[PDB]
Design an enzyme around this catalytic site. Structure first.
Site, short mmCIF file in Angstrom:
data_model
loop_
_atom_site.label_atom_id
_atom_site.label_comp_id
_atom_site.label_asym_id
_atom_site.label_seq_id
_atom_site.Cartn_x
_atom_site.Cartn_y
_atom_site.Cartn_z
N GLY A 17 0.82 -1.16 0.00
CA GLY A 17 0.00 0.00 0.00
C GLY A 17 0.85 1.22 0.00
O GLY A 17 2.01 1.12 -0.16
N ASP A 131 -10.39 8.02 -3.15
CA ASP A 131 -9.59 7.02 -3.85
C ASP A 131 -10.44 5.83 -4.30
O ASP A 131 -10.01 4.73 -4.23
CB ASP A 131 -8.43 6.59 -2.97
CG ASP A 131 -7.25 6.05 -3.76
OD1 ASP A 131 -7.13 6.37 -4.91
OD2 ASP A 131 -6.45 5.31 -3.20
#
Ligand SMILES: COc1cc(C(=O)N2CCOCC2)c(F)cc1Nc1ncc(C(F)(F)F)c(NC2CC2)n1
Length: 269
Positions: A17, A131
């Protein structure tokens, strides 16, 4: 919501991530399955910190079947212990062109995502994820009869403010025109609604949004904003779905519908 030092066996690394790594794990007490996100460090490091922290703060208050749950926190690096969504992410599933997702399942996915966003938008104040793209939609199950098929993940870029937020967003193929321009204009949860149109498009076509076009970055951004460039909805799209996608990706945020309407329309498909 209180720490969980140990009590967790690591099983394997499943991802990466913005701020660290992601692993699949088991809990000893139940042995229940879990996902662990670690934080691994101008500065980049500050953004990483802020992002990890933001995910914790936002997720701390959420509880919905179509939202990944936060279970506990760990302190050795530190870490977030979350729900493990076993079928992976939507973006990768869609890449498997030979095995198209069954239409009934596509509908479950669309509805499930809409329910999660509807829940985000009904918070006080509303949450803007910022996002929403296919890599951030996780698949619990591809069984048309499962209780839950899809969940929204990765709240690292999320805001929950009384007023409009701002900040330029990359991943322009997924982002609203008011969020991608060089001048840092403000926006709202209506930006997420636009992103959802693009999620609908990708599910429907199995294609990346805007992949039909090729432009340099400046031209692409200008086209989306000033020429209304959008992905082409296939002719075979059901009329009610075409309408939802079109309204959701309206240049004017005010024209993008409330999720009560979106969810009612999707349920009619
Ligand atoms: C069995 O669970 C998964 C398998 C995969 C997967 O299909 N892999 C196949 C190729 O190797 C990497 C893992 C996956 F991408 C995500 C999985 N689950 C999962 N569950 C929860 C999360 C989380 F952190 F957001 F809460 C998550 N984040 C994705 C990995 C970045 N992934």
């Amino acid at each position: 919501p209180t720490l969980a030092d140990n009590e967790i066996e690591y099983e394997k690394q499943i991802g990466k991530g913005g701020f660290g790594l992601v692993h699949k794990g088991r809990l000893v007490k139940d042995k229940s399955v879990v996902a662990i996100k670690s934080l691994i460090l101008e500065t980049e490091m500050i953004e990483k910190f802020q992002e990890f922290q933001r995910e914790v703060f936002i997720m701390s208050n959420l509880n919905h079947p179509n939202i990944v749950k936060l279970y506990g926190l760990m302190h050795n690096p530190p870490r977030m212990v979350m729900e493990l969504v076993p079928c992976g992410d939507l973006y990768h599933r869609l890449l498997d062109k030979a095995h198209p997702i069954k239409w009934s399942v596509k509908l479950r996915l669309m509805l499930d995502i809409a329910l999660g966003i509807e829940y985000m938008q009904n918070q006080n104040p509303p949450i803007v994820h910022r996002d929403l793209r296919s890599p951030n939609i996780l698949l619990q199950s591809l069984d048309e009869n499962a209780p839950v098929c899809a969940k929204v993940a990765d709240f690292g870029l999320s805001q929950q403010s009384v007023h409009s937020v701002s900040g330029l967003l990359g991943n322009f193929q997924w982002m609203a025109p008011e969020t991608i321009g060089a001048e840092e204009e403000s926006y709202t949860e209506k930006a997420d609604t636009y992103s959802f149109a693009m999620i609908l498009y990708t599910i429907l076509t199995g294609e990346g949004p805007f992949d039909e076009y090729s432009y340099g970055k400046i031209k692409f951004i200008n086209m989306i904003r000033e020429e209304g460039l959008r992905p082409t909805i296939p002719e075979d799209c059901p009329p009610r779905l075409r309408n939802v996608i079109e309204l959701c990706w309206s240049g004017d945020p005010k024209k993008r519908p409330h999720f009560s309407y979106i969810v009612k329309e999707l349920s009619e498909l």
